[PDB]
Amino acid sequence: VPTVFDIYSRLLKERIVFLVGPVTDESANLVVAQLLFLESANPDKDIFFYINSPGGSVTAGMSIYDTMNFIKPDVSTLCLGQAASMGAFLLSAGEKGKRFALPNSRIMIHQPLIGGQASDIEIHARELLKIKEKLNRLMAKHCDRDLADLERDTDRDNFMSAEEAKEYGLIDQILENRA
Amino acid sequence: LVPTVDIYSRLLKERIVFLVGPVTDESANLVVAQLLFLESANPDKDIFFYINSPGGSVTAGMSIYDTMNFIKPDVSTLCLGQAASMGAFLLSAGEKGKRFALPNSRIMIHQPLIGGQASDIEIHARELLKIKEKLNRLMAKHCDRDLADLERDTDRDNFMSAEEAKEYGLIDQILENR
Amino acid sequence: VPTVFDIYSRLLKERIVFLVGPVTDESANLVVAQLLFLESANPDKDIFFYINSPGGSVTAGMSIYDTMNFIKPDVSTLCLGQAASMGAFLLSAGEKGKRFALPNSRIMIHQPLIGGQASDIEIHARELLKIKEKLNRLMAKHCDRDLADLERDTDRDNFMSAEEAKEYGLIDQILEN
Amino acid sequence: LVPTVDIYSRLLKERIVFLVGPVTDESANLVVAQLLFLESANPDKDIFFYINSPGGSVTAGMSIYDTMNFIKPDVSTLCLGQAASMGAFLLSAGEKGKRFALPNSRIMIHQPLIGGQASDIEIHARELLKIKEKLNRLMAKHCDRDLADLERDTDRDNFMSAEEAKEYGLIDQILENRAS
Amino acid sequence: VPTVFDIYSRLLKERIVFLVGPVTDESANLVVAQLLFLESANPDKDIFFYINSPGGSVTAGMSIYDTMNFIKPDVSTLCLGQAASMGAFLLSAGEKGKRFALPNSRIMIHQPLIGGQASDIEIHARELLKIKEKLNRLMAKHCDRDLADLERDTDRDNFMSAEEAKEYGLIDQILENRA
Amino acid sequence: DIYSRLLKERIVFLVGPVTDESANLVVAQLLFLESANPDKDIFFYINSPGGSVTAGMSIYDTMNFIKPDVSTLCLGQAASMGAFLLSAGEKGKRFALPNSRIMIHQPLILGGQASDIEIHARELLKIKEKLNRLMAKHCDRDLADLERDTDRDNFMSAEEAKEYGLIDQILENRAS
Amino acid sequence: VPTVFDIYSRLLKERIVFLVGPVTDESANLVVAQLLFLESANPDKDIFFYINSPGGSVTAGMSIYDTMNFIKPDVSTLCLGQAASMGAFLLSAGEKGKRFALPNSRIMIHQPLIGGQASDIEIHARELLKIKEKLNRLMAKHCDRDLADLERDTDRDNFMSAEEAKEYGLIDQILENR
Amino acid sequence: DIYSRLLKERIVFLVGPVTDESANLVVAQLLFLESANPDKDIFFYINSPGGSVTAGMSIYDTMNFIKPDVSTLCLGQAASMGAFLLSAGEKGKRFALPNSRIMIHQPLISGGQASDIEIHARELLKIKEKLNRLMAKHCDRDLADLERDTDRDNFMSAEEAKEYGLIDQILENRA
Amino acid sequence: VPTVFDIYSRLLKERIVFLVGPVTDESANLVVAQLLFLESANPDKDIFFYINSPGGSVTAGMSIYDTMNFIKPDVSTLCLGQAASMGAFLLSAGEKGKRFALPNSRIMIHQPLISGGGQASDIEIHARELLKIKEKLNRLMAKHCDRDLADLERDTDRDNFMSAEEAKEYGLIDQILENRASL
Amino acid sequence: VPTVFDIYSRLLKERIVFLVGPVTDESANLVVAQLLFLESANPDKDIFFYINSPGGSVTAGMSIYDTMNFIKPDVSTLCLGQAASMGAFLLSAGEKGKRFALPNSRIMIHQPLGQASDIEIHARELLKIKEKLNRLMAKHCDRDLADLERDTDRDNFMSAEEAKEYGLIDQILENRA
Amino acid sequence: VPTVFDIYSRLLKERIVFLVGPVTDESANLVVAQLLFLESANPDKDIFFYINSPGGSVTAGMSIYDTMNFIKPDVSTLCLGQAASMGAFLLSAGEKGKRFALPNSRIMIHQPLIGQASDIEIHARELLKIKEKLNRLMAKHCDRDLADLERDTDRDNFMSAEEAKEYGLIDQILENRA
C-alpha cells in the first residue's frame, strides 16, 4: 500500500471510509473504529462511506449499521463497483438524501443465505427466519417501500443498475462527476 | 472373506436376516429383498431379523419398516450387541410378542440428528421436525406408551439395558438361551 | 489498520477496548492487558468494553471476567453486532447499570460445548459439569434471576433481541444514539 | 489370497471359528454367523473358538459373548498370539474348563478407552462408566475373582503371560501340544 | 497489539510479565528474557508474573523456573483464567506468600504426558519417570506437602478451584480486587 | 491356483511382513495340513522381513502344538520374526538356500501418561528377554550371546546362520 | 485376463514362467512357486523363464536364483524387452547353453542402489557392500569373467545390446526366430 | 467372455497404453496362439497411444519370433509404440480402418550425477536411432526420412500412413 | 517481542547471546553473527552464551564451536532448560571454568543420528564420513570433559540424559548456579 | 534478528559477508549486492566472505564467483561449518593467500548432480559445466585437471588440513594468532 | 535484507537495477518502476541493468523491454550467473556497445513454450506471432538474420559468454573494468 501516511489513512483525513470485499467481524469492526474516530475528530462534518462489497456476515454488518445510526455525523454512502447483500443493506442505510451510486455500479439484494439435533436445527432455522424478516422490514424502511415489495423482491438474487436502485429507493442520486 | 458351507445365504435358508452396521440405502434394500424372498419361499413361516446396528438413514429404515408390516410372515426381531437410532426403531417394530434382545445388548433412542437460502432451510427444517414427530408417533405405538413419554425420553440419547427396554415396551423378552 | 498512532490505539486513549471475534487466550489477554493499562492511566474513569464475539474459551473469558471485577474502574459493556456464549457472558458481567446493546445486536446464551480412558473421561466430564453450573450461577447473579431460569434457558442455543436481553436482566439499556 | 483345498471354510467343519484382528460389527457378526451355523449343523458338539485379537467394539464383542452363551454347544476358546481388551473378555468367556492358551500367548485387560453439549457428554460419560462396571463384574464372574480385584487390575493396561492368565482365572489350561 | 510503547512493553515497565498459552522453548525464553531485564533494571523490586497457560514443554518451563529462583527480585505469581500442568508448576513456584489467583481461576496438576529399539524406549521411559518424580518432589516442596500426596494427587488430571489450590498450598491468597 | 496346489504337497509359504492376517493364514494352513495327515512333515517356506511379535508367536506355538514336524526353509531372507520362525523349525530340518540371508535384532517399535509408558516399556522389555531366551534355545546358545548379538541388526549368511545354530543345513539342491 | 484356464496358467502347461515388472517379495515368490510346481509336474523337462524386468529387491531375486539352481529341471532364460539389475542377474543365471535374448532386448547391469544412528548406518552400509561384492562374484561366475571386470563394468549403469550381452558372457545365443 | 471368445478367432487386442503388464499380456496371447496353431495367421488389433519402448520391444520381437504371420489392424489410433507395432505386422498384412489415426515421434521421457545423466542420455539416443532404423525398414523408406519425420509429433491419416509405408491397405469393409 | 531496543537486543548490550530451539544453519549463523559483533565491540570482555536447545546439524554446530574458540573473548556458557545433542556439545565447549547450568537443567549426549539413498559407492562414502564425524565429536567431547575417549564412546552409544549435577560430575560443565550467591 | 542496524548490516561495517545455506538465485544475488556495496564503500580494503553452505545452483554460484574477481578489493574466504559443492568452489576462489578454514570445518567437492533431442541438449550442457568446474577448480588448487576429474567423481569430503594440502585453502585458523 | 536503506535501495542510488529469478508481472513491473524512477532522478546518466534470470512471461518481459527503449537514459545490461529465455532477450536489448557478460555467465535462447478448437486455434496463432516477433527483435539486437534465429531457437541453445559475444548478443566480456 502506497505512502504519502498510507493511502487509506490519508483519505481518512478527508473523512473517507472504505468497505471493500466481504463483510467480516474484523473488516466491519475496522469500519466501526473509523466511524467512531471521525466522530471524535469532528462531529459536525459528514462521513463518506465508500462501499465495494459482495456482502458477508449479517451480524458484522449490523455493527456497522447501528454505529452509522448511533454517531452524530451524517454517514453518506457511495456504491462503487457493486454493493450486494449486506453491502447493499449498508449502502441503503446511508443518511437519506446522501446515498449515491456511480453510474456503472450494480446493487444486489436477496434473502439470507447459509448440523445437529432436530431441536437445534429448529432453533437456528427460526433465528434465520427472524433475521430475514428483520432485514426485509429495515430494508423497506430504507427504501420507503411496502414490506410486501421487499419480501417478493428478495426471494432470489435481484440485481439492479444504479438507475434501478434509485427508482427502488435504495439510493438518492447517481453521480456522473464532480459537476 | 466369507466362509462357504456362503454362511449368510446358508442362514437365510433358516429364515435368518441380518442388519449389521449402519442403515444405508443399499443395506436396507438388501433386507427388503431378503424379506420379500423369504415370504415368497414360505409365507407361513416366521422370519428372524437379527439387528446389530447403530442406525442410519431414516428413509432407508422406513423401507424395511413398511416391508416388515407389508408381508404376511411375522418378522421377529432380535437385538444382539446393540440396536440404536433406526436400529432400535426396527427392533421395536417386530411382531408384538416376538421382539427379543440378548442379555448384554443395549438399546439407544433419540430424535433425528443431521445449506441454502432461508426459504430452503425453512423447508428442510419443517421436514426434519415432521420426521421427528412421526418417529415419536410410531415409537409410542410400538411401546404401547403415551406420546408424551417418547418426546421427553428421546430429546437426547437414551441408553437402555435389555431389562429397561423390556420395561419400556421396546422388546418382549430377554433370551439367555433356548 | 489505518494510522492516525493506529486507529485502535487512538480509540484506546478514550478508554475504548474491543473484543472482536473468538475468545482465545491471546485475544483475551490482549483485553486484560488493555484493562490493566487503562486502570493505570486513570483508575477513576469508566472503561467502555465493546463486544462483537461468537464466544470461545471459558477459561480465556474467565481471565477477562475476573480482571473486569478486579480493577477499580467500572467496565461498561456494549454489544455491537452480537454477543454469543462467553461474549454474552462478558456483556452481562459489565457494571450493573452500564451494560448496553445497540438496537440490532443479538445475544445468545447456552450451556458449555466441546478422548482417553473411562477414568479420564469421567474426570473431564465432571469438570465440564462443574463449569456448566458455575456459569449458570454467575449468569443468574448477573441477570438477577433464579438459577432454575438460567439452567432451563441455556439448555440449547437461546437467541435474544436487544429488548429480550433487556427483560432477561442481561443488559440494562438499548442505545439508539 | 486364501488358498483352496478356502482354508477357513474347510476348518469351519472341524468346528473351528477364528477371531483375528480388531473386533468390529462385521467381524463380530461373521463370528456370530459361524457359531449359529455350527450349532445348527450339530448342537451337541463342541465349538473351538481361536482368538488372536487386540480388541475393538464392546457392543460388537457383546454380540459374540451373548451368542456364545445362547447356543447349546460348549464354546471352547483358545488364545494364540494375543487376546487383548474384548479379545481377552471373549477368551475368558469360553466354557469353564475348556479355556486355553498356547504357551507364548499374551493376554491384556484394561478399562474402556474411547464432543457436543455438556448434557450429551454427561450422557455418554455415564454410559461409558456403566460399560466399565458391567465389564468388570462379568470379568470377575468369568475369573471367579472379586469385583474389587478386576477394578484394580484394569485401571491401566495389565499384560499377563499364559501362566499369569491361568492364575488370574481367565483360562483353565496352557496347551503346549496334544499332551497337557 | 496496541500502542500507548506497545501495550505489553508498557505493562513490562510496571514489572508485569505474562505467560499466555502453551509453554514452548520460544515462549519460555521470552519470559526468561523479561525476568533478566527486570532484575537488571531494578534487582530490589518485586516482579509480577501473570500466568494463563495450559502447560507445555517441561524443560522449557524449567528454564523459567530456575530463572525465577536465580534472580534477586521476588517473583510474585498470579493465575488468571487457568494455570494447568507446567502452568500450575510455575504458579506454585512464585515467592511464598506472594502466590495468588483470581476468584474464577482454575488450577490443574497431573503426571507427565507424551518409537525405536527397546533399548532406546527403556532409556526414554526411565527419563520420563525421572521427570515425573522430580516434578512431584518440587511440587511437594512448593506446596509444603508430603511427596506421597503429590504422587496420589497427580496420577490423573486434578482440577482445583482457587480455594482448593489455596488449601492445597499451591497458592497463598485469592484476590477479588485490590482490597 | 499355484499356492493351493503346492499346499497339497504340504508346502506353506510365509512371504512378506508378519501381520495378524498373514500369520493366521499360516496357522490355518498348519492346522489344515495336520487335519489332512498328522503324521507327515510340513515344509514351511519363509521369505519375510519380520513384523508383529504376537502374530509370529501364534505361528510359533502352532508349529510346536501340532503333531507334524515343521521343517523350515529360508529363501531370499528371514529377518527378525522371519528369522525367529526359521530358527523354530524341527531340529535337524531347518534349512537355507545358499544365498539366503538371516537377520536378528532386538524388538523395534509410545503415547500416553508416564504410568502407561512405564507399563508398555516393561512389557516390551519382557518380550525382548523372552525372544532372546527362546532364540538361545533354538540355537543351543547362551542368553548372553543372544543379548549381545541382537543389540543392533545382525545380518548373517547361510553359513554364518548355520554356525550360529539358527539352521541345520544349507541346501544347494536336494543332495542334502 | 482371457480364458483359454487363464492365459498364464495355460502357458504354464507349456512350462513357460514369466517375470514381468519389478522384482518384489510377492512377484519373486510367485515365480518360485511356479518353478517348484513345474519340477513337481515333471522334474526331467526344461523350464522356460521369460524375463522382462527392470530389477528390484536383491533378496527377492535371490529366492528365485537359488530355486533355479535347486530344482532338477534346467531353467532356460529368455530376455524380452529388457533384463536390468536383478532381471539381468537372473537371466545370466539360466542353465549355461540355454540363456537367450530376443534381438531388440536390452540388458543392464549395475551395483546396488538404495536412517538411524551412526552405528546402524555402519551396519547397513557394510551389509550393502557385502551384497555388492557377492553379486559381482556370482556375476563373474555366470559370465566366465574375472571379478575385476564386473567391479569395473557395474560401477555405473551398463546398458548392453543383445550382441553385447552375448559377447560379455551374460547370455548364450540371440534368437531371431525358431 | 467376449475377449476370450475373439481369442479363439486368433484376434489379439492391444488397447490403451503399452506397459510391462499390458505388453506381456499380448506376448502371452501370441505365444498361446502359436502353440495352439503355429501355421495360421494371428490378427493383432491395435488401439493405443503408445507407452514403454522396452515393453513395446517385447511384443515386437515376439511377433517376429513366433511362426504365425502376425497381421496388424489399427482401429481408433496407433500412436508412438502403437504405430511401431502396427508397422511391424507381416508385410502385406498391415491394415487400418479408414478413420484410424497414426502418429510417430522420437522417444519422449516423462519425468542423478552428470556421469549417470551422460550414460542415460546416450542410451536414449541409441534407442532413438534403433527405432528410426527399425521404422525405416518397416516403411521401406530411408533412415533420413524417419529421422526428420519423427523430430516432432507427426499425425497421419490411414491414406498417409499407407503412402508412408506404415501399413499396406485400408479396409473399408469385408470386400 | 517486548521493547524497552527489543528485549533480546537489550540483553545483547549486556553481552548475552541466546541459542533457543534447534541448531540450523540459520540459527547457528545468527549466533556466530552475534559472537563476532560482541568481539568487535569488545574483544577483552566475556560473552555469555545461554543455551536451551535440543541439538541439530553437526556442521552448523561446528561453525558456532570454532567461532567460540576463534574469537578472543572468553565465551562462558549457561544451560537453561536443556542442552541436548549439539546443544550439549556447545555447552561443554565454553571457556573452562565458565560453563554453568541452572539446577533443573537437563543435558543429553549421543552419537550422530541421521534421518531421511544412492549407489553403494556413495553410501560407503557417506557412512564413513559419518563415522569420522562420530569419532571427531567423541574426541572433542573427551577433551571438553577432561576424560578418556573410551568413556565418551561407551557413554554416547545411546541417548544419555544427565542432571545438572551429573553433567558436572561428568565434566561437561564446571558449576551449578542456584543464584548469584552460588558463585 | 537483533539490533545494535540489524546484526548482519552491522557486520557489513566490518566488511563481513555471509553465505549461509543453499546457493539459490536470490541468496547468491544478495551476496553479489553486498560485494558491490563494500567495493563502493571502499575499493581498497579487503572483504571477508564467510561460507557455511551445502552448495546449490551452479549459475547462482557463478554470479558470486565472477563478482569476486570483478571487484577491486581482495575477497578473502573463510569456511565455517562447511563449504560443500558450490560452497567449496567459492571458498577455493578467494584471493590466493587469503583463503582460510576454521579447524573443524569440512570441505566437499563433487561433480555436478522432454524429447530425446532436448535431453541430449541438456545433458551435454551439464557435461560442459562439469568440465568447466573441474578446470577452474584445478586453477584454484594449482593442480592437474586430471586430479580434479578423479577426485570429484563421487563426493569427496575433506578435513581442513586435507583441503589445505589439496590447495583448496591456504591456511587453517584456530584463533586470532 | 541488510539495512545499511536495504542493500538494493542503496545500489539503486548508484543506478544499478537487478532482475533476479523468474520474469513475472510483479518482477517485471518492479523493474519498470525503478527504470522510470532513475530517469526521473536523472534522465542523462546511464542505467546498469543486472540480469540473473531463467526467463518467464513474455508480455511481462516486453514491459521491461519497451520501457528500456522508452526512457532517455542508455540502459546498459550485465549478465551474471545466467540470462535465459526472456532473460537473454533483455540482455540482448541493452544499449548497443554497453551489453556485457561476466566471464562465466551463460546465455540460453529458445522459442516460446507453455478450450474449444476455435479458441485453441486463436491461441496457437497468437503464440506463433510471438515466436516470429521475438525472433525478429532478437535478430535486430544481434545484427543477424531472422532465418538464423529461427534455426538457433528451435530448441534450447546454451551459449558461453564468448559464443554470445560472437553471436552479437553482447558486446564485451568483462573480467574487470573494461
mmCIF file of N, CA, C and O in Angstrom, chain J residues 13-65:
data_model
loop_
_atom_site.group_PDB
_atom_site.id
_atom_site.type_symbol
_atom_site.label_atom_id
_atom_site.label_comp_id
_atom_site.label_asym_id
_atom_site.label_seq_id
_atom_site.Cartn_x
_atom_site.Cartn_y
_atom_site.Cartn_z
ATOM 1 N N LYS J 13 29.607 -3.382 8.223
ATOM 2 C CA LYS J 13 30.501 -2.276 8.540
ATOM 3 C C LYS J 13 31.891 -2.776 8.893
ATOM 4 O O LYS J 13 32.850 -2.000 8.855
ATOM 5 N N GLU J 14 32.025 -4.054 9.236
ATOM 6 C CA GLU J 14 33.323 -4.694 9.356
ATOM 7 C C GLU J 14 33.765 -5.373 8.057
ATOM 8 O O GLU J 14 34.797 -6.047 8.051
ATOM 9 N N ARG J 15 33.025 -5.175 6.957
ATOM 10 C CA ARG J 15 33.318 -5.782 5.652
ATOM 11 C C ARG J 15 33.176 -7.309 5.695
ATOM 12 O O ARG J 15 33.887 -8.034 4.993
ATOM 13 N N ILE J 16 32.236 -7.794 6.518
ATOM 14 C CA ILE J 16 31.909 -9.212 6.644
ATOM 15 C C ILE J 16 30.683 -9.545 5.805
ATOM 16 O O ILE J 16 29.616 -8.943 5.987
ATOM 17 N N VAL J 17 30.814 -10.533 4.918
ATOM 18 C CA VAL J 17 29.698 -11.022 4.111
ATOM 19 C C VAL J 17 29.521 -12.518 4.351
ATOM 20 O O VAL J 17 30.493 -13.281 4.307
ATOM 21 N N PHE J 18 28.287 -12.936 4.584
ATOM 22 C CA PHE J 18 27.976 -14.333 4.839
ATOM 23 C C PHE J 18 27.264 -14.968 3.641
ATOM 24 O O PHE J 18 26.402 -14.346 3.004
ATOM 25 N N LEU J 19 27.630 -16.210 3.341
ATOM 26 C CA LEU J 19 26.822 -17.113 2.526
ATOM 27 C C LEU J 19 26.444 -18.291 3.415
ATOM 28 O O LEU J 19 27.322 -19.065 3.820
ATOM 29 N N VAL J 20 25.150 -18.419 3.734
ATOM 30 C CA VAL J 20 24.665 -19.454 4.643
ATOM 31 C C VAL J 20 23.518 -20.224 4.003
ATOM 32 O O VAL J 20 22.500 -19.633 3.632
ATOM 33 N N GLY J 21 23.632 -21.553 3.978
ATOM 34 C CA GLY J 21 22.603 -22.381 3.399
ATOM 35 C C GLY J 21 22.740 -22.502 1.890
ATOM 36 O O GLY J 21 23.780 -22.172 1.307
ATOM 37 N N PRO J 22 21.691 -22.999 1.235
ATOM 38 C CA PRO J 22 21.775 -23.303 -0.205
ATOM 39 C C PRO J 22 22.023 -22.073 -1.061
ATOM 40 O O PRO J 22 21.540 -20.976 -0.774
ATOM 41 N N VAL J 23 22.807 -22.276 -2.117
ATOM 42 C CA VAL J 23 23.090 -21.244 -3.111
ATOM 43 C C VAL J 23 21.952 -21.256 -4.128
ATOM 44 O O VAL J 23 21.858 -22.167 -4.951
ATOM 45 N N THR J 24 21.091 -20.246 -4.074
ATOM 46 C CA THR J 24 19.976 -20.036 -4.994
ATOM 47 C C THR J 24 20.217 -18.750 -5.795
ATOM 48 O O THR J 24 21.184 -18.033 -5.558
ATOM 49 N N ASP J 25 19.342 -18.435 -6.744
ATOM 50 C CA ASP J 25 19.461 -17.136 -7.410
ATOM 51 C C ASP J 25 19.389 -15.972 -6.407
ATOM 52 O O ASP J 25 20.200 -15.035 -6.469
ATOM 53 N N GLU J 26 18.434 -16.032 -5.465
ATOM 54 C CA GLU J 26 18.193 -14.933 -4.522
ATOM 55 C C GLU J 26 19.299 -14.796 -3.469
ATOM 56 O O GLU J 26 19.782 -13.697 -3.220
ATOM 57 N N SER J 27 19.702 -15.887 -2.821
ATOM 58 C CA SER J 27 20.717 -15.741 -1.778
ATOM 59 C C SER J 27 22.076 -15.392 -2.389
ATOM 60 O O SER J 27 22.863 -14.666 -1.777
ATOM 61 N N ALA J 28 22.351 -15.876 -3.607
ATOM 62 C CA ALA J 28 23.592 -15.528 -4.303
ATOM 63 C C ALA J 28 23.597 -14.068 -4.730
ATOM 64 O O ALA J 28 24.634 -13.395 -4.657
ATOM 65 N N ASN J 29 22.464 -13.568 -5.226
ATOM 66 C CA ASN J 29 22.449 -12.172 -5.630
ATOM 67 C C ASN J 29 22.556 -11.260 -4.424
ATOM 68 O O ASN J 29 23.159 -10.183 -4.516
ATOM 69 N N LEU J 30 21.998 -11.681 -3.283
ATOM 70 C CA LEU J 30 22.175 -10.898 -2.072
ATOM 71 C C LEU J 30 23.651 -10.767 -1.752
ATOM 72 O O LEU J 30 24.132 -9.664 -1.473
ATOM 73 N N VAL J 31 24.411 -11.851 -1.935
ATOM 74 C CA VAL J 31 25.858 -11.783 -1.731
ATOM 75 C C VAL J 31 26.499 -10.879 -2.771
ATOM 76 O O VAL J 31 27.380 -10.079 -2.449
ATOM 77 N N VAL J 32 26.098 -11.018 -4.043
ATOM 78 C CA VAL J 32 26.649 -10.167 -5.094
ATOM 79 C C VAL J 32 26.452 -8.706 -4.730
ATOM 80 O O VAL J 32 27.391 -7.898 -4.773
ATOM 81 N N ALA J 33 25.236 -8.363 -4.304
ATOM 82 C CA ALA J 33 24.930 -6.980 -3.946
ATOM 83 C C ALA J 33 25.864 -6.461 -2.841
ATOM 84 O O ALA J 33 26.449 -5.380 -2.966
ATOM 85 N N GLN J 34 26.088 -7.262 -1.792
ATOM 86 C CA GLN J 34 26.956 -6.820 -0.708
ATOM 87 C C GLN J 34 28.387 -6.632 -1.192
ATOM 88 O O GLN J 34 29.067 -5.686 -0.782
ATOM 89 N N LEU J 35 28.858 -7.512 -2.081
ATOM 90 C CA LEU J 35 30.203 -7.329 -2.609
ATOM 91 C C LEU J 35 30.306 -5.994 -3.328
ATOM 92 O O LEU J 35 31.271 -5.244 -3.122
ATOM 93 N N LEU J 36 29.284 -5.659 -4.132
ATOM 94 C CA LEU J 36 29.272 -4.381 -4.836
ATOM 95 C C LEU J 36 29.228 -3.205 -3.862
ATOM 96 O O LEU J 36 29.891 -2.184 -4.089
ATOM 97 N N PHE J 37 28.455 -3.320 -2.774
ATOM 98 C CA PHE J 37 28.390 -2.210 -1.825
ATOM 99 C C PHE J 37 29.731 -1.989 -1.128
ATOM 100 O O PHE J 37 30.186 -0.848 -1.003
ATOM 101 N N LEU J 38 30.383 -3.064 -0.673
ATOM 102 C CA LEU J 38 31.644 -2.900 0.044
ATOM 103 C C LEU J 38 32.728 -2.332 -0.863
ATOM 104 O O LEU J 38 33.575 -1.550 -0.415
ATOM 105 N N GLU J 39 32.729 -2.734 -2.132
ATOM 106 C CA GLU J 39 33.641 -2.147 -3.099
ATOM 107 C C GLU J 39 33.337 -0.678 -3.283
ATOM 108 O O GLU J 39 34.250 0.143 -3.440
ATOM 109 N N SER J 40 32.050 -0.339 -3.325
ATOM 110 C CA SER J 40 31.659 1.056 -3.436
ATOM 111 C C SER J 40 32.076 1.838 -2.198
ATOM 112 O O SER J 40 32.589 2.958 -2.303
ATOM 113 N N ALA J 41 31.883 1.240 -1.029
ATOM 114 C CA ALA J 41 32.179 1.918 0.225
ATOM 115 C C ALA J 41 33.672 2.124 0.413
ATOM 116 O O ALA J 41 34.079 3.083 1.075
ATOM 117 N N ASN J 42 34.492 1.202 -0.089
ATOM 118 C CA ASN J 42 35.944 1.300 -0.014
ATOM 119 C C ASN J 42 36.568 0.253 -0.923
ATOM 120 O O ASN J 42 36.684 -0.915 -0.527
ATOM 121 N N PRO J 43 37.006 0.620 -2.131
ATOM 122 C CA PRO J 43 37.509 -0.388 -3.075
ATOM 123 C C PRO J 43 38.895 -0.916 -2.749
ATOM 124 O O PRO J 43 39.391 -1.781 -3.482
ATOM 125 N N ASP J 44 39.526 -0.428 -1.683
ATOM 126 C CA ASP J 44 40.923 -0.732 -1.394
ATOM 127 C C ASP J 44 41.106 -1.538 -0.128
ATOM 128 O O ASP J 44 42.245 -1.781 0.271
ATOM 129 N N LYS J 45 40.025 -1.916 0.533
ATOM 130 C CA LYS J 45 40.082 -2.729 1.733
ATOM 131 C C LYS J 45 39.537 -4.115 1.421
ATOM 132 O O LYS J 45 38.611 -4.269 0.622
ATOM 133 N N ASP J 46 40.121 -5.119 2.058
ATOM 134 C CA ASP J 46 39.712 -6.497 1.838
ATOM 135 C C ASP J 46 38.263 -6.714 2.261
ATOM 136 O O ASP J 46 37.733 -6.025 3.137
ATOM 137 N N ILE J 47 37.619 -7.687 1.622
ATOM 138 C CA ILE J 47 36.301 -8.161 2.021
ATOM 139 C C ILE J 47 36.477 -9.556 2.603
ATOM 140 O O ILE J 47 37.280 -10.346 2.093
ATOM 141 N N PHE J 48 35.728 -9.862 3.672
ATOM 142 C CA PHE J 48 35.829 -11.146 4.363
ATOM 143 C C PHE J 48 34.532 -11.926 4.144
ATOM 144 O O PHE J 48 33.489 -11.589 4.718
ATOM 145 N N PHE J 49 34.622 -12.994 3.335
ATOM 146 C CA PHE J 49 33.477 -13.767 2.846
ATOM 147 C C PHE J 49 33.414 -15.089 3.611
ATOM 148 O O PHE J 49 34.245 -15.981 3.393
ATOM 149 N N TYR J 50 32.444 -15.196 4.519
ATOM 150 C CA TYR J 50 32.288 -16.356 5.390
ATOM 151 C C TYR J 50 31.285 -17.308 4.762
ATOM 152 O O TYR J 50 30.146 -16.911 4.488
ATOM 153 N N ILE J 51 31.694 -18.559 4.554
ATOM 154 C CA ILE J 51 30.909 -19.530 3.798
ATOM 155 C C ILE J 51 30.550 -20.701 4.707
ATOM 156 O O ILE J 51 31.437 -21.410 5.196
ATOM 157 N N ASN J 52 29.246 -20.907 4.911
ATOM 158 C CA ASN J 52 28.685 -22.101 5.549
ATOM 159 C C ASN J 52 27.515 -22.534 4.670
ATOM 160 O O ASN J 52 26.377 -22.118 4.909
ATOM 161 N N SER J 53 27.799 -23.362 3.653
ATOM 162 C CA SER J 53 26.828 -23.696 2.601
ATOM 163 C C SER J 53 26.974 -25.139 2.143
ATOM 164 O O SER J 53 28.109 -25.631 2.015
ATOM 165 N N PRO J 54 25.862 -25.828 1.865
ATOM 166 C CA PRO J 54 25.939 -27.172 1.269
ATOM 167 C C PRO J 54 26.051 -27.181 -0.246
ATOM 168 O O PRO J 54 26.113 -28.268 -0.826
ATOM 169 N N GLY J 55 26.069 -26.024 -0.894
ATOM 170 C CA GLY J 55 26.083 -25.935 -2.333
ATOM 171 C C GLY J 55 24.760 -25.444 -2.886
ATOM 172 O O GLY J 55 23.945 -24.823 -2.191
ATOM 173 N N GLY J 56 24.546 -25.732 -4.162
ATOM 174 C CA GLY J 56 23.308 -25.359 -4.817
ATOM 175 C C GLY J 56 23.536 -25.052 -6.291
ATOM 176 O O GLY J 56 24.384 -25.663 -6.942
ATOM 177 N N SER J 57 22.757 -24.085 -6.776
ATOM 178 C CA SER J 57 22.731 -23.756 -8.195
ATOM 179 C C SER J 57 24.107 -23.294 -8.675
ATOM 180 O O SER J 57 24.743 -22.436 -8.051
ATOM 181 N N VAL J 58 24.556 -23.864 -9.802
ATOM 182 C CA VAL J 58 25.871 -23.524 -10.355
ATOM 183 C C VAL J 58 25.867 -22.123 -10.967
ATOM 184 O O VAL J 58 26.847 -21.379 -10.838
ATOM 185 N N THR J 59 24.810 -21.759 -11.705
ATOM 186 C CA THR J 59 24.801 -20.424 -12.294
ATOM 187 C C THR J 59 24.751 -19.366 -11.201
ATOM 188 O O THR J 59 25.415 -18.331 -11.304
ATOM 189 N N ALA J 60 23.997 -19.632 -10.129
ATOM 190 C CA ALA J 60 23.958 -18.712 -8.997
ATOM 191 C C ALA J 60 25.338 -18.563 -8.376
ATOM 192 O O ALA J 60 25.792 -17.445 -8.111
ATOM 193 N N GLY J 61 26.033 -19.685 -8.166
ATOM 194 C CA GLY J 61 27.386 -19.617 -7.645
ATOM 195 C C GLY J 61 28.342 -18.882 -8.569
ATOM 196 O O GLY J 61 29.268 -18.208 -8.100
ATOM 197 N N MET J 62 28.133 -19.002 -9.890
ATOM 198 C CA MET J 62 28.981 -18.297 -10.851
ATOM 199 C C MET J 62 28.817 -16.786 -10.751
ATOM 200 O O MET J 62 29.784 -16.041 -10.965
ATOM 201 N N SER J 63 27.603 -16.320 -10.441
ATOM 202 C CA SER J 63 27.389 -14.890 -10.265
ATOM 203 C C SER J 63 28.206 -14.361 -9.080
ATOM 204 O O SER J 63 28.746 -13.248 -9.139
ATOM 205 N N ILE J 64 28.300 -15.138 -7.992
ATOM 206 C CA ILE J 64 29.186 -14.752 -6.892
ATOM 207 C C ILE J 64 30.630 -14.812 -7.345
ATOM 208 O O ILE J 64 31.419 -13.893 -7.105
ATOM 209 N N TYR J 65 30.982 -15.894 -8.033
ATOM 210 C CA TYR J 65 32.364 -16.142 -8.407
ATOM 211 C C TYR J 65 32.937 -14.997 -9.242
ATOM 212 O O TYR J 65 33.984 -14.438 -8.898
#
